[PDB]
Ligand binder design. Sequence first.
Ligand SMILES: NS(=O)(=O)c1cccc(O)c1
Ligand SMILES: NS(=O)(=O)c1cccc(O)c1
Ligand SMILES: NS(=O)(=O)c1cccc(O)c1
Lengths: 1725, 263
Amino acid sequence: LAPRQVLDLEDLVFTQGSHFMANKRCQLPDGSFRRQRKGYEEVHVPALKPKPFGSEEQLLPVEKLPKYAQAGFEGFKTLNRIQSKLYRAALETDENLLLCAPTGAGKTNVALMCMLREIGKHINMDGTINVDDFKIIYIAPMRSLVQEMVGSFGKRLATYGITVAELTGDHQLCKEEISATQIIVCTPEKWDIITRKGGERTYTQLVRLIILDEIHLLHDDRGPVLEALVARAIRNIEMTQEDVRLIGLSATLPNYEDVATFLRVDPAKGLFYFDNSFRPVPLEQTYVGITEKKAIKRFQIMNEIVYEKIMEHAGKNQVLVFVHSRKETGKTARAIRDMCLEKDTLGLFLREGSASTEVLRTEAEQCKNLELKDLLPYGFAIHHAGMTRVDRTLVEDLFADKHIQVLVSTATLAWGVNLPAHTVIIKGTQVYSPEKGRWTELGALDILQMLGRAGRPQYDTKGEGILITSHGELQYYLSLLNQQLPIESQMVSKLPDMLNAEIVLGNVQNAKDAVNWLGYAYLYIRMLRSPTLYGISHDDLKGDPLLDQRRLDLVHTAALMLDKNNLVKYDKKTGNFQVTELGRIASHYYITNDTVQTYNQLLKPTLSEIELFRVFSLSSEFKNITVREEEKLELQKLLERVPIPVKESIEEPSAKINVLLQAFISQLKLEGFALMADMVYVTQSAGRLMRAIFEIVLNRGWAQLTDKTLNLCKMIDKRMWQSMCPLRQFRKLPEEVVKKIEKKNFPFERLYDLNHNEIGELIRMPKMGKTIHKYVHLFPKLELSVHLQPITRSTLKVELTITPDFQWDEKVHGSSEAFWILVEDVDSEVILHHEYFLLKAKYAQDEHLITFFVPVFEPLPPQYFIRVVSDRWLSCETQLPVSFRHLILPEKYPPPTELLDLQPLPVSALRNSAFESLYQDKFPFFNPIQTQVFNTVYNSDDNVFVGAPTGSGKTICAEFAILRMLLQSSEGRCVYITPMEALAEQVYMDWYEKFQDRLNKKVVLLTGETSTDLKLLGKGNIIISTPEKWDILSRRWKQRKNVQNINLFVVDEVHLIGGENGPVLEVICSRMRYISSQIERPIRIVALSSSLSNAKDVAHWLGCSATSTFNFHPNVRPVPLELHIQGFNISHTQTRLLSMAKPVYHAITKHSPKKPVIVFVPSRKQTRLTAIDILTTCAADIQRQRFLHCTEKDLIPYLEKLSDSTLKETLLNGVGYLHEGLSPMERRLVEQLFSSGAIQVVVASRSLCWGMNVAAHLVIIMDTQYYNGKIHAYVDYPIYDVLQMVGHANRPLQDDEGRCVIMCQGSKKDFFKKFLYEPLPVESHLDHCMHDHFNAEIVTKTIENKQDAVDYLTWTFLYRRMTQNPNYYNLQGISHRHLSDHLSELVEQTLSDLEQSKCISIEDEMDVAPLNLGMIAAYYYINYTTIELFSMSLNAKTKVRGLIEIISNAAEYENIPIRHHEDNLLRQLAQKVPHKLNNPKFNDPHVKTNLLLQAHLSRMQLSAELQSDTEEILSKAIRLIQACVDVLSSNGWLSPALAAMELAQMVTQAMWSKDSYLKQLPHFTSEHIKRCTDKGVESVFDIMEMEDEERNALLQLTDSQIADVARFCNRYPNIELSYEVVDKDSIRSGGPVVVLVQLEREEEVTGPVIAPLFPQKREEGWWVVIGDAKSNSLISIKRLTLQQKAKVKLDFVAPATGAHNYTLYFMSDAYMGCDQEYKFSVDVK
Amino acid sequence: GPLGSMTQTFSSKTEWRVRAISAANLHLRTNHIYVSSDDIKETGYTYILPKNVLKKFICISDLRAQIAGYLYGVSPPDNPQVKEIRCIVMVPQWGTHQTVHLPGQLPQHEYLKEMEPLGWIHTQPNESPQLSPQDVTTHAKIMADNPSWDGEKTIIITCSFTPGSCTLTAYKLTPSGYEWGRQNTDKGNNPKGYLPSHYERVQMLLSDRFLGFFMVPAQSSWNYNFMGVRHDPNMKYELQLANPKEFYHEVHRPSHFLNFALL
Ligand SMILES: NS(=O)(=O)c1cccc(O)c1
Ligand SMILES: NS(=O)(=O)c1cccc(O)c1
Ligand SMILES: NS(=O)(=O)c1cccc(O)c1
């Protein structure tokens, strides 16, 4: 550790890259010989003989393959030799493989066999492939190779349903195809940059197979990318335990056994080496090394050798010459053809009597490439990249058709096309490398590929490869092509960059991690095997045999480099590595670490375009660029005229680079070959370098520089300046007409107002006015509008409405269009806020709503600005000024209620020994708040408001009120409302203990079931309910006297009126005040709240006198709260969380080293990760297991009962975690371990912050945002959640203080300080949520006209806040008339919506009345939109499947949780659903709801969190079904109504229609019911009516389970049914048909329905239906509940005379099998 | 001497490049802004200029070509002797080192209707102990064509480029100044009749207490020093609430970009 040494990495680099030659000798095959000639040596190597066929190794017929793999070999008889040797390993095992073989020997078809093995793992029983279960990565060095592989793999695999595709260039926008691509083909660099980013919900986790083609690229300067990939893959396997198969495909070169080690290939199983005798066609090799040094003579010697070699093949063999410049192809073909002309040898290529000459003549005439014109008639051709696609195809076809005889080409053809040739000549091995800034040798991979093209596989008996080079390189190339150039690691040069990547990912957090990581590099393997090659003494190795010290030194040196350049904070003592935003940007944009140092040093907010271009030009990627004298004058020209001035002299490379960029944007042609290659190299990387600069300055808030930089990105991409007509960006438009437009210099915007006539006139080219008009309105364009909503005098909420104002067209806009929203300050200098905005094609015609906060101050600034600017189109932007001249700020909030210093109030103050027994054992005195409010709460009847921080004990104040009520009325009724169900449950437990057990009163919890809840209201003295349960109960207050005779109404957490669910709370509170004003005996109200800035408004709305509203501010919490806010200036979530990891541990050891700690984290996965990370940091620290405070043995019993291994490990080391996916027992075990003091730390997910029964000394909130998968974006924690989390840091009976650390993105810091240090302002959102409440009030005749609706509103918190903060509700004045107009408009809009939905009628545009649909929506408490959609969908022929569909698309399910982990799960769950629908559709909550319903009816499986999801769905299914029943009945449809009635039974018992009723009985399964039907029993009464002894042999029997079977059978409905028709022998037509129907139950109302698979406890419901099955006509229906005996009367109107037979139906809603059916037929007489 | 033995080739070195490089550094001066208080006593109101728009004005300027903005403001409710400059308006314009060329038409926008015109601010290459006779002529001719400019209320602020800094001094015309200026057709440096008793210094103070804003042309930009042919004393323009672009911004010199691509 400590005695580290700082290395010089550059002195360890192999500078020659792939040209490095580790071997000192080269052994030539037998028969090779050397001949000398004037100026050059020739070395001939004879073609090898193919090896004998071993020991009867037989070629494998495709028939012998596994049948699922045979389709991938369609059209072949037998595998080739290498495939036959590889079949078992490739297809029958999952072994990692390394295959070394000569180029073209068959490696690709082996890779196909591996892919087929992977495909086999996903073949369903129906023969289809799961395709969404997996992904395969094929990594190829060159892009042209990538494309050919996409073609060939796609064609081989089409028959399987497999999609193969290349990875696209704009990953920030296009990932939708990647989700449909099973086989991704790409370069190493692309895969590196993709796995470098986190990616949130990536697809990298599906990758099961990686193929690394041409892996000998390890020896190239690109090799470290492969080492990075493999190291990352193997370590990620370790930290996932999910295998990935690795397949390496290699040339036959030394060290292949070390490559195998590096890939974790077992040599005895996965290593295969095939020497060069396995080349598909043997290769005779000729190497020509020129000794001449003088340039001119050397070039002529070259051309002479080429000519003479051509002459050995003219007329006999095609010859493919490879040269290394596009211009050089033509220059060389011309050199040779002219030499042939002078020597009268042109005739040997094209003889007479062959139509080939004519084909060449005619195809050269119509070719239109001038060099091709001059050459094709002579049989010579050229092929390079800057040529037409069909002209390259012309060359390829003509060469394949043997017309061309001499073809001069570049490397691109060798990599991209499958075009072999008998003779191949490599003319010179020097190529210009702009990155190296100099001429260099061709890379080995290029040489191998080019020579691999020699010899056509089935036309040639041998191939002939001639390589021409300088003499000093002969040995090098002789080694490369004869199995002897060893593969080495080029990695030390890239070490710092690679290390930073692993740091940014969190894979490496310290030097020990980095040593571990380097242990997976190919560099490490080679260092172990050849230390002296890598600068290590043999003695040094024997003293450091695993090279631990050497790796620590390498990591140390790289870390110091990165720390110097501000990518990483490196602590040398600990060795710790802290990530930075600069480091992250360098990794994610593939920037070398020196470049971001430069950017950080030179970027300033005041930079001009001038200095921006210079900064870019200083990038270390260009460090080898020089200014050659021969380039100067040309450059000088451009430098005298560039539109961006250049400060430095043309002596400086910086200036050449700047000028190259500006020239590339201006699309300037340059002449020097050096200059053009350099310009290409500069601009190829300009894009992502400038995007890195953009991200830097954007996240710093630098408005001007952000504008200039994004602009420069777009000019680089579009290759034009801003000054140019943006119409140029429609490539389809003629350049001539856009130039005509440019000439008139008028503003482009003015085109939007004219028409095709006027535009054609202004252009002076009317011919196509229309065309240009079209394009003008295709140009992206947005309209902007704001609603300003003051929160305080210093914080402003903004709602921005984005209205698209252009025609969409997929061929110009694709499927999405991206923008940045930038909120800039008074001076357009600071970005106050910014966010990415994506306009999808499916919403191109829709307004989009964006909401954000911005700071404001006093005196108000003139204006802010909202810019919305395209992320890719130049000159595409809209700026909306936001002036504040008429902003109405709210009044500064009042001072808090002073906390008076009172003597602590003893419990004895209650003056009641019974009452005092509730608290006297808990504490001696009440805290100061309870002490201060006691007199008012306990000794008066005033309405009371108590606002105070969470943890101030406001619940005891509610209890004071309840005790007073108990003294005034022995049967007093208090109703207590709290907004979350988990809080309701906790309060129910404590208050049951207090008031039922110790005071002998009735305490009840409302369930949500109307009948049950009305009973509970009648009998209970303390009634605990969530808001909606009380809303449905209290709407019917006119007809429910227990709702009026409420003595006391307590509402807890009332500040939540301002939150997402606040409207229902506000309504029920308003209703209680309204009832109390109506009944002349007032209902006392006590409201409890977090500290409120506008407490007085809440109090006045609830009728609290100033003397009884206690508005305490956060500083008065009884346990003082020390709150720290830590900002993290990192805008990438996964990186920010990483940077928080160690600070979490330090905050623990700083603020609570000994006492309990709760850490809140944003997600389920993060609980586990952070628990582990705390443990890891613990063990590295001196203090390990410091968080366990009980013996391992005292904890083991607790542990064994869990199903999570990680949870038992972490608990064993003192750290629990809590997330939704744990069993409720597991949550209980962890919580009890935490309250015991056994475990000191617990990591909980945010979603649990409302249902936790633990508290702590220290709460740490680790980040304040979570990922919403439905909208695919991050969402801020609501402030209410954060207040609740902070409130967990509160232990009155143990601590002198509570401590909380909130770690947040830096941009959020000020906001939290504003709304945590000070009391909270809350507002109403009732005006956005009125329809259901208005509808209900029109059902109950509270609202009978529009004036009634206004008066109604007068009772609400909305109405009070409209006068105090008008702009928040879009009022512009507080005058009484302004308010009246506003309320009238709100009323008008809401009533109009309801009337259009057919829920209400409006007469004389004044009076309103409920319609059937509104009454159903109100009765069942269903969103009116749901009921309208029901009315549309239900169709009198609806089947149970259509019912599940309709009800799954109810609005009540659009908020059911969504997590795309289930997506794949879900895609398999839809595979077996018994009923059929049209489209599987991703992750919309409706389809998850339908799926979980399917899994309920047919008890498919037992999910985890989806089990709670199913429970929530079942909480509303029954009411939706009953609403459907009412709709169908009101329309007279018999069969769909009975179908829905059985669907209620189905959902209750979890069955289908064609299932056995015996499925309802406990402890039954399938074989039991099959054998019961085998013995004649298919009814529950069938099993009841038989002696016990026989029944026990009839079924597999357990005695004590029979008791639950018996409780069911005795609870099963056994109703005997009578019915008379009332005096219908004297019936008249059109009059009264009255049927009396009596139901008598033996004695079965002991309690609820037995339905254990239903989450709510239910009571049996019944329907009596009179119908006619002939016409499917519902005639009469009544709904009833039965208590042993009851009679009912059904009404009908006689329709005709005679022949009338009606079926009577008795239908349950809870059980199956006990429906009854009778018939009756009285006649009209 | 040699006719061909020592031949050398001229290479263009255009003038605006050096000035663009120079304008890039203007932000350094916004932190050394000095107001001349040399007038022992004050004649007129007291004008208060908010720093934020002054800094932007300096930053969008050029070291040689003068630029100008119109001044709009109000008196604080307290005392009518204070004039708070609330707005600077940039209109289509060009200039030399001596003068500015502005359209005849004054700013017209509803957003300005509750403010009163207070004159104009302009840059100058060098400090001067006297108000320019060009400036006197310009202010007088504006007053003669626009009765909303009261000579006792409208001022001229000069922003002179002292080395490393900026010096602001504020003047008003005197009645003799207005009468001479409005009939002066000599645009030179020493015209007939010009008198130092044609102007007088007014008190001016820089403030951070409040912030001003800009208005700019609605469809063009303000800088026409590269499009001089297209600028005309009778050109009309609307305004918009937005901040001005800097002198050498690309939309001010489009011919430099379209001409380079023609090489
Ligand atoms: N596709 S991979 O190499 O196995 C990989 C690497 C890192 C993280 C991942 O989630 C996946
Ligand atoms: N960011 S801001 O509120 O608009 C602001 C404040 C102070 C001086 C300024 O020039 C601008
Ligand atoms: N706290 S922040 O908004 O994400 C931020 C601020 C400064 C630089 C950054 O890279 C990021």
